[PDB]
Amino acid sequence: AQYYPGTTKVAQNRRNFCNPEYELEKLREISDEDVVKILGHRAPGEEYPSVHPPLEEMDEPEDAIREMVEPIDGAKAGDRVRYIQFTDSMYFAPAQPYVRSRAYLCRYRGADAGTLSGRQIIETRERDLEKISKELLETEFFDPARSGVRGKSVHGHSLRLDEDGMMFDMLRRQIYNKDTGRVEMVKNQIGDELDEPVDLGEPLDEETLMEKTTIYRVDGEAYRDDVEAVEIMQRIHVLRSQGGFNLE
Amino acid sequence: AKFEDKVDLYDDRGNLVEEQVPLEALSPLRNPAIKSIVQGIKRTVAVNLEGIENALKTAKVGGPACKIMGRELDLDIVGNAESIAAAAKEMIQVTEDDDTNVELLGGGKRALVQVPSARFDVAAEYSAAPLVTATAFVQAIINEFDVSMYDANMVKAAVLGRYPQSVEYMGANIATMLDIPQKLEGPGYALRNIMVNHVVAATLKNTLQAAALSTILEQTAMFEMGDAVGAFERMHLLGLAYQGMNADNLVFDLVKANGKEGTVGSVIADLVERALEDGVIKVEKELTDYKVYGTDDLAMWNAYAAAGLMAATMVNQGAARAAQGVSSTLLYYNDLIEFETGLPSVDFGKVEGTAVGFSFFSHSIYGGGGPGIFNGNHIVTRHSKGFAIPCVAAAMALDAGTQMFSPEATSGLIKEVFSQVDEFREPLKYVVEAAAEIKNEI
Amino acid sequence: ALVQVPSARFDVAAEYSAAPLVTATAFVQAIINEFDVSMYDANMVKAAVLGRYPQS
Amino acid sequence: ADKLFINALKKKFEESPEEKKTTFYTLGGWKQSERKTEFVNAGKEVAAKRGIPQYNPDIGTPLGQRVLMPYQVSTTDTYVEGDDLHFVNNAAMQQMWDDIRRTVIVGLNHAHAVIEKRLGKEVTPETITHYLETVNHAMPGAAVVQEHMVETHPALVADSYVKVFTGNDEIADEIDPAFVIDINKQFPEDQAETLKAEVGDGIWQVVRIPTIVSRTCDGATTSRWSAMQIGMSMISAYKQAAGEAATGDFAYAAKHAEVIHMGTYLPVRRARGENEPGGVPFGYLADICQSSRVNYEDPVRVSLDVVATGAMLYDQIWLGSYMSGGVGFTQYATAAYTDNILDDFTYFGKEYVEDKYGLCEAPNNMDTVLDVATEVTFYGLEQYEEYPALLEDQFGGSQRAAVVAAAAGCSTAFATGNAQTGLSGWYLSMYLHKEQHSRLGFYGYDLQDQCGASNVFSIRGDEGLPLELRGPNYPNYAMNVGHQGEYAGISQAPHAARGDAFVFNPLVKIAFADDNLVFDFTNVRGEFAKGALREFEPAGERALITPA
Amino acid sequence: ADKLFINALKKKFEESPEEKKTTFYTLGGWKQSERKTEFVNAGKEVAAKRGIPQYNPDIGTPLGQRVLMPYQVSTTDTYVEGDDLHFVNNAAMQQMWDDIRRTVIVGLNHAHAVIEKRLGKEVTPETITHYLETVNHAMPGAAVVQEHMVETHPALVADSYVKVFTGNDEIADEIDPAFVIDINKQFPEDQAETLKAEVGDGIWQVVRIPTIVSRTCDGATTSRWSAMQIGMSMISAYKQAAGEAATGDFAYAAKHAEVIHMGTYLPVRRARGENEPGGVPFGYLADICQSSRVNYEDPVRVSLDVVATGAMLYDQIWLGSYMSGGVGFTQYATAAYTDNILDDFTYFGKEYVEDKYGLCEAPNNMDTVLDVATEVTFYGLEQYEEYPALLEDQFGGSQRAAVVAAAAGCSTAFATGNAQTGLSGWYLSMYLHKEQHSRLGFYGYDLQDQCGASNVFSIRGDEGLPLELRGPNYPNYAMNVGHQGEYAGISQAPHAARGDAFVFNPLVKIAFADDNLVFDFTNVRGEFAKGALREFEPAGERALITPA
Ligand code: F43
Ligand code: F43
Ligand SMILES: C[C@@H](OP(=O)(O)O)[C@H](NC(=O)CCCCCCS)C(=O)O
Ligand SMILES: O=S(=O)(O)CCS
Ligand SMILES: O=S(=O)(O)CCS
Ligand SMILES: [Cl-]
Ligand SMILES: [Cl-]
Numbered sequence A: 001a002q003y004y005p006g007t008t009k010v011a012q013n014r015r016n017f018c019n020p021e022y023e024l025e026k027l028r029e030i031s032d033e034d035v036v037k038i039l040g041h042r043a044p045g046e047e048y049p050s051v052h053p054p055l056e057e058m059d060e061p062e063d064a065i066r067e068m069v070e071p072i073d074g075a076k077a078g079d080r081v082r083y084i085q086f087t088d089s090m091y092f093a094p095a096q097p098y099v100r101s102r103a104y105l106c107r108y109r110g111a112d113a114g115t116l117s118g119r120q121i122i123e124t125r126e127r128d129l130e131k132i133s134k135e136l137l138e139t140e141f142f143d144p145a146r147s148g149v150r151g152k153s154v155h156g157h158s159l160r161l162d163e164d165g166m167m168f169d170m171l172r173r174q175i176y177n178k179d180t181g182r183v184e185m186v187k188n189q190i191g192d193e194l195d196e197p198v199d200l201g202e203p204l205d206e207e208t209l210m211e212k213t214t215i216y217r218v219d220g221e222a223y224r225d226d227v228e229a230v231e232i233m234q235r236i237h238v239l240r241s242q243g244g245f246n247l248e
Numbered sequence B: 001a002k003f004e005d006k007v008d009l010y011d012d013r014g015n016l017v018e019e020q021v022p023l024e025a026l027s028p029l030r031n032p033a034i035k036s037i038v039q040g041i042k043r044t045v046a047v048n049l050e051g052i053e054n055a056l057k058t059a060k061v062g063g064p065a066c067k068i069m070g071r072e073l074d075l076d077i078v079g080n081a082e083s084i085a086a087a088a089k090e091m092i093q094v095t096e097d098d099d100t101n102v103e104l105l106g107g108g109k110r111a112l113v114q115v116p117s118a119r120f121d122v123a124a125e126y127s128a129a130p131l132v133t134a135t136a137f138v139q140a141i142i143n144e145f146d147v148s149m150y151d152a153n154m155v156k157a158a159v160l161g162r163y164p165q166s167v168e169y170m171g172a173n174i175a176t177m178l179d180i181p182q183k184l185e186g187p188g189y190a191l192r193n194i195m196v197n198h199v200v201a202a203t204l205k206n207t208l209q210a211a212a213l214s215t216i217l218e219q220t221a222m223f224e225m226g227d228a229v230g231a232f233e234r235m236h237l238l239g240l241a242y243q244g245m246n247a248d249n250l251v252f253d254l255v256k257a258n259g260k261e262g263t264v265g266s267v268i269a270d271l272v273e274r275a276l277e278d279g280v281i282k283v284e285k286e287l288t289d290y291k292v293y294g295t296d297d298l299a300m301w302n303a304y305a306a307a308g309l310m311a312a313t314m315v316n317q318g319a320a321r322a323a324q325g326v327s328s329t330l331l332y333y334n335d336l337i338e339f340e341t342g343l344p345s346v347d348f349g350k351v352e353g354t355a356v357g358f359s360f361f362s363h364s365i366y367g368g369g370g371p372g373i374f375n376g377n378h379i380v381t382r383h384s385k386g387f388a389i390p391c392v393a394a395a396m397a398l399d400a401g402t403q404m405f406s407p408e409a410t411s412g413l414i415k416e417v418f419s420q421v422d423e424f425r426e427p428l429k430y431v432v433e434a435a436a437e438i439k440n441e442i
Numbered sequence C: 001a002l003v004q005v006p007s008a009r010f011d012v013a014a015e016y017s018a019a020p021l022v023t024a025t026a027f028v029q030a031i032i033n034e035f036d037v038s039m040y041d042a043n044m045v046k047a048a049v050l051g052r053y054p055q056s
Numbered sequence D, E: 001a002d003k004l005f006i007n008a009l010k011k012k013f014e015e016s017p018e019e020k021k022t023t024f025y026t027l028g029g030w031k032q033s034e035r036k037t038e039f040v041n042a043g044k045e046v047a048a049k050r051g052i053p054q055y056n057p058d059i060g061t062p063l064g065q066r067v068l069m070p071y072q073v074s075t076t077d078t079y080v081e082g083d084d085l086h087f088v089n090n091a092a093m094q095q096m097w098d099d100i101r102r103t104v105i106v107g108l109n110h111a112h113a114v115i116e117k118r119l120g121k122e123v124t125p126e127t128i129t130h131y132l133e134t135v136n137h138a139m140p141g142a143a144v145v146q147e148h149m150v151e152t153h154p155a156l157v158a159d160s161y162v163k164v165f166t167g168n169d170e171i172a173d174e175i176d177p178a179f180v181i182d183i184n185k186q187f188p189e190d191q192a193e194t195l196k197a198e199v200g201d202g203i204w205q206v207v208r209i210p211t212i213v214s215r216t217c218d219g220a221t222t223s224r225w226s227a228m229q230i231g232m233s234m235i236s237a238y239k240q241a242a243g244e245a246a247t248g249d250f251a252y253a254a255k256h257a258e259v260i261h262m263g264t265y266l267p268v269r270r271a272r273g274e275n276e277p278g279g280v281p282f283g284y285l286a287d288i289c290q291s292s293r294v295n296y297e298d299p300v301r302v303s304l305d306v307v308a309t310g311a312m313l314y315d316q317i318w319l320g321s322y323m324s325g326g327v328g329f330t331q332y333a334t335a336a337y338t339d340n341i342l343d344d345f346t347y348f349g350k351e352y353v354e355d356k357y358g359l360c361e362a363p364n365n366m367d368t369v370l371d372v373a374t375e376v377t378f379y380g381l382e383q384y385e386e387y388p389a390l391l392e393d394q395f396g397g398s399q400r401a402a403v404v405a406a407a408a409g410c411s412t413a414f415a416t417g418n419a420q421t422g423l424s425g426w427y428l429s430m431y432l433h434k435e436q437h438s439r440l441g442f443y444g445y446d447l448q449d450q451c452g453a454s455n456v457f458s459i460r461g462d463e464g465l466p467l468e469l470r471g472p473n474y475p476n477y478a479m480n481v482g483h484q485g486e487y488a489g490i491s492q493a494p495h496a497a498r499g500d501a502f503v504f505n506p507l508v509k510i511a512f513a514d515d516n517l518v519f520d521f522t523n524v525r526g527e528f529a530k531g532a533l534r535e536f537e538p539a540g541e542r543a544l545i546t547p548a
């Protein structure tokens, strides 16, 4: 598959995020327990709540489509559907909102992805969400200064950075510590304080942010200069326009 | 004859039924099983005799939480259902051997009613079904128990609700898949104002049958609306065939190939490969490490892409066994496939647009709700001309119990009655059989 | 012009609006095709035939 | 004793009420009237200020060739010229409508279930109280989640709030009482037990959006505004994701699945959305009026307070403005709530019935209709014949038709305990009246009247309905003055005689049992008098945001 | 010269507009804000008075962790916090809507034909003047025929009146000028000639019913109220029997055959009658705005005054209240009429077009769309990239999408002279924007956006329509913020560039060329600023009839 046109680093990074054969660079290690804490849906050691009985316990009639589609593990179990939501700075965060939704529906099964300017969300069965979330948090999808895990009060994608290079957060869930140069997650994604903070590593430096970013800007790579990418967008506009009129 | 296209038709197990069927044999305008389904949905009513009885006994008539103290009437309606139904049938039929059906269900708690087709032949629209049924049962109940002049208006309220003070039959104890003509978003929309949960209920959550019924209703509406007239007709027919009738087993085979481990993205890759293999698309231009695809048959590309969209919903929402992400699939299947190919997405962006608003209105404070309460007449989901809602029906068929406003919650009376009707429950079977029968008359 | 839309369209319709809607689009398309009215202008033909619908 | 209207007639005219002759043409036309004099002066000022002629007493025919009467607001000692009972000139009347229009009832039963199943979190009086603190900040138009929100001025929206009620006493007593409509406090014991049994363990919100918003917008705004702020408050108070799939279940529940509108939407010829007067069924109007819970030992008073509520809303605001406009229909309505006239006639009928049958003990049949409605019709008409001042007071035949038939219909329902035979009595009254005086109402008054007898007991599609379920959109009723508010009274009458806590919807009854409303629904006629005197303080005014 | 938004950015923030970094969390939350401080105090007072908690800054999340910004109202020197631009808090905004809602246009052409034929009487400027004196007494709610009528207080209804216009100068000049909208006085010469040629010898009334009535009732009241008092005035002024068969022809003419509503009624899911915002097509909104007749040498100013008119009405009042409510959608709209941002982008585009093509001289085709909309989109997006303060100002992607695409679409229409290619440019802008920043608007912003390109030139039943005829009920447009007012601007744009006197209805254009309106439609943004400052005087208040 092709994924996206263009000849910039931005375009290549957009392709790489979508391509499930591209190995996402892992930048930080997070424990299973800390991913559960960040998500904030259940406490460590708490059983997965259920929304319906295990599929095995149900008495479903013959359906060729069901038979051919393997349910994700959390569907088999009857897990609740839960979410993880990220905000990405327009100051060169590595991932960005449509990049995420496009990538998620290439890489992940059973996924409900939503894109907005200030927030991007995936909803799926809880145990599967935990596995996906580890990857979203440990890899280059995430920078702990220019991205934020936020289930509410999302403002900041379009704001100026603070003096530490951190994105604004009304609820200050991610705190830069000068003494380590590392960011700690001190609250879960909905804003409730964690008993013990989670190390999220060092912010990426300017050079590395520019290598990895998927936003086009005049002070990075400008979209207007990725003429092949613009060409395809204009093509789609014209072909849609013609088709709506007379199917030519 | 008008179009040269032929399609191969299969059953809901993926087995060939008939090869080389002319496309127009599937047209709502030509296929006698689509006609039978549409006329059947116009004429069928579910009567809740138990509900009528309970409303009367408690004087709870006229809508939610309403009650008139002192008006209670205790009538043994369910215990006398056979007599009441027979008396109602005498009034509903036009002649004694016509196609009127009145059948008791649930030990007399419910009745299936099919009002004779001849009443609709001399009607402007479809409201004769609830209105003739309602008055026949009101009169039959009154006559069964010799309900007085002074009390009979309570029977009327228990059957049809607050109408005509309300525009709708508010509090009624009858149900139809159609809704009243005043609620149409536009002229021609009535076959679109059929809740997705009703379609899923009637087809007993069989995914392919739910998709087929929804597609039949949506694309038949496109003919009534004039959208499938002239330049657009073939596009709509190919969409019916490939997205809703599993033409050429394309939906089925894409699901087979992607069901074990696949994603929306993997379905897209397979569909583009298949379109290329079949000569529907071709490389038009080479950019830098990027092939720009073109087509000489936009309607066929659209149909192939629509089949892939259905398969992607089945794979994505089937894997989750949770319907909510159908709004996401409908969006990103289309968004991704445009940047994958350089070709326009299904319905030239209109599925994608529908999906944007449907996503919003199924994940926000402002309106909408869960996938099952939408329909082709809903302001959020009317925009695509038949290519979105059938995917929502498939997704809800595949939901294992994640929805509060499920078909069990919204559509139980519809389920009990309308699933009895073979052509409603298994429409793919009957439409394919009818297409094979008329194949040499096109 | 007197137009009578074929009865078969109503046999598979819920109601009667196919008469104006099928007639309107057939004449909009026929006029566009007669004069090769451009994509940019054809929406005026639509407005002339069916009016302010669907805003009204 | 004097008939109940004698004091009012003596106030209006120098002659005793029995006197047959008078003298006209000597009062100076408009100059006899304080109010017309105010209007003449105001019109001159207005015309000069704006440069366009306006009110001018010399246009058309010269008002006041006869006495321009004061009216007593019935059950009060307030006498005012009728202009002070025009809805435009009466802020109490305007606010009564705003308080209905801006109210919706919204369950918490589905919402609490979504919380407990889908999200898997618990609900208690404590979590409900926290939610109510939250929604009472949010509902008037203030923020709870996003940064850089801009908000409504609290003082402009001081009339907006959310309360709850439930039949579960233990829950009701544990929620902060600021937020609770206490059924045990507001209703007498028998009525409270009825209402609590209807509601059971359900929990319902009574949401009132701001008057200033309702006036800027329309009735169909109310349930939407309500639902937005319920949705935000569910997100905030229960620490939900701020926009996930489950959020849509709260929306659907609050907007559709557990909402009770005051009025349903109307057909296209009279197109309107929800919460407009034409959609309010007669049984709801009777339940909105709170006379039932205060005046329960006097079924006449309860019934006639409902009549006042309805005559004003349905004839003055609805038919006289929404459906027409201009000078409008003040006195078509005032006939039913002034001079203690309808009161005199209806007390006569209640005594007739109590003495002959006992309340609610007459057979529910046509024999009772014929007896009671005929007797009361003849009493009312005799009063116009015996008191020339009374006939000159209620000068329009329609007014008399409505008043006489309201007394006859209410009295019939007092006898039978059933509104439908009450309604039959209303129509019989019209037929008798028409033959007695060889006149009835205005040109179009008895459209519904003549369809009336046949449609009382019909069961056909757009004909058959219990009276309580009928309303201004019942086909025969959709056009004409001098009926709708009186039908709301007839709907109330048997329920008042029976001692029932409500007429048609117990949730609607409870939802107006609330002294935080601007209008006092326990004493509708007292409020109309206060508004007439320019002593009523409405919500919604813009003084705070305009110059001194 | 500096970019037009630079002054506003320097007012908002201590940093220069180019600076990438700032400091947060040190402003004291709400305490930084005069307006939030007013609100906190008001909430305390409201809650104490009524016994129910209300506004409380400690509910939910703490506003003001960043700067709570002032906004410059574009084309003014007025800077206000955004709360002062909330429609609830801004009497100018409320009155703008009331002045539209309470207006209808009603011909006298059928009426005068009925007079001359059916009644066999002559019509002259003198008889028309007498009729107009009569209807200006009657229209606010005063009587002309019956005895013992009770009437509206003239001072409460001082804003209600009737004027006329006609394209025949000699006829116009013979009618008393107090009643005439003088086309030659209100419009520049070329526009006046266009408008007079459209009207010809037709004679049209502009009827405004009282604001207090419109606020009590709804938009569907307007044409009815109008017709009642036209009817009474025809009876009085032309000496008819007061209720004969011919009377019904005047009713049908005034209510149906020659009435022009501001808005058409809406379908049931969003049920509303006439004269509600959703029924007002974009071309009418552009014609209601009177910038065209004042600022005609500056097509950008004209277009952006229309955008302001529509963004406020359609997003703040209509989508933000009628269709939702709560805190609502102030800043979704303010983005299009503050900080001179849309102005900067649109002047850039107009100048680009002037220089490359000449206004209205580009080919009306997709080549022009691609050229202009792309260039203008990239300019606007570059400004957010160059000026971090600008991006933090218009912080919501939807706001940016609307502003950039409005500039792109208007500029495209300036080039082609055709609104439909302007519309295509709007959608292309969205598509480019989405790819450039990997984001666009809120969850549901681009429903219409993605359907957009295909539906621009469609001819199908519920798809195909010239932009001028589209409105808030066009299916794709029926739900979402950040589009409708911008579309009204695009509708205006080619007509402003062409010098056309109107966009879609010349009668609507003339009907608002009237300084007897309460709101000044020639200077919409100036009026919004006046209202924000609490300096606007609305009609409709009840002060005269309530306690001091
Ligand atoms: C709860 C929702 C989901 C929903 O259905 N509506 C919400 C909230 C709602 C509330 C917020 C009021 C409050 O805080 O109590 C109101 C004001 C509507 C109302 N009920 O009165 C609103 N949004 Ni929202 N909403 C807005 C916007 C937005 C932008 C904000 C992005 C950012 O970076 O700050 C995003 C969507 C996006 O990412 O594009 C957004 C989301 C959301 N919007 C998320 C909450 C986001 C969060 O957790 O912080 N709105 C805007 O983009 C600007 C205009 C602004 C609206 C108020 C106004 O117009 O003044 C407000 C419009
Ligand atoms: C022009 C009509 C025909 C029509 O369509 N409406 C009229 C007039 C209209 C106007 C009169 C205002 C004015 O004088 O300018 C208004 C107020 C409606 C409006 N446009 O605001 C009205 N009638 Ni009428 N109209 C009334 C009535 C009536 C009674 C009055 C009979 C009598 O003996 O005086 C009669 C019908 C009948 O004979 O039954 C009647 C007729 C008529 N009604 C005759 C005029 C009669 C005359 O020439 O004197 N109204 C009433 O019976 C009482 C209530 C009264 C209404 C005002 C209020 O409710 O306060 C008023 C209601
Ligand atoms: C979708 C529909 O809601 P329902 O699904 O019918 O509840 C509709 N609301 C809206 O379109 C809300 C529009 C304003 C708020 C969102 C602005 S982006 C309405 O209330 O009629
Ligand atoms: O005279 S009419 O009966 O037509 C109107 C009475 S208000
Ligand atoms: O977050 S959502 O896009 O659903 C609403 C924005 S106001
Ligand atoms: Cl919270
Ligand atoms: Cl100028």
Ligand SMILES: [K+]
Pocket: D214, D215, D216, D217, D218, E214, E215, E216, E217, E218
């Ligand atoms: K209003």
Ligand SMILES: [Mg+2]
Pocket: A029, A030, A031, A032
């Ligand atoms: Mg590990």
Ligand SMILES: [Mg+2]
Pocket: none
């Ligand atoms: Mg460079």
Ligand SMILES: [Mg+2]
Pocket: B146, B147, B148, B149
């Ligand atoms: Mg009998």
Ligand SMILES: [Mg+2]
Pocket: none
């Ligand atoms: Mg190659």
Ligand SMILES: [Mg+2]
Pocket: D009, D010, D011, D012, D013, D014, D015, D016
């Ligand atoms: Mg005296």
Ligand SMILES: [Mg+2]
Pocket: D256
């Ligand atoms: Mg409903």
Ligand SMILES: [Mg+2]
Pocket: D515, D520
């Ligand atoms: Mg009080």
Ligand SMILES: [Mg+2]
Pocket: E009, E010, E011, E012, E013, E014, E015
């Ligand atoms: Mg500064």
Ligand SMILES: [Mg+2]
Pocket: E053
């Ligand atoms: Mg407190």
Ligand SMILES: [Mg+2]
Pocket: E174
């Ligand atoms: Mg002269």
Ligand SMILES: [Mg+2]
Pocket: D050, D051, E177, E178
């Ligand atoms: Mg003047």
Ligand SMILES: [Mg+2]
Pocket: E515, E520
């Ligand atoms: Mg002025």
Ligand code: NA
Pocket: D056, D057, D058, D059, D060, D061, D062, D063, E143, E144
């Ligand atoms: Na006079």
Ligand code: NA
Pocket: D143, D144, E056, E057, E058, E059, E060, E061, E062, E063
């Ligand atoms: Na707060």
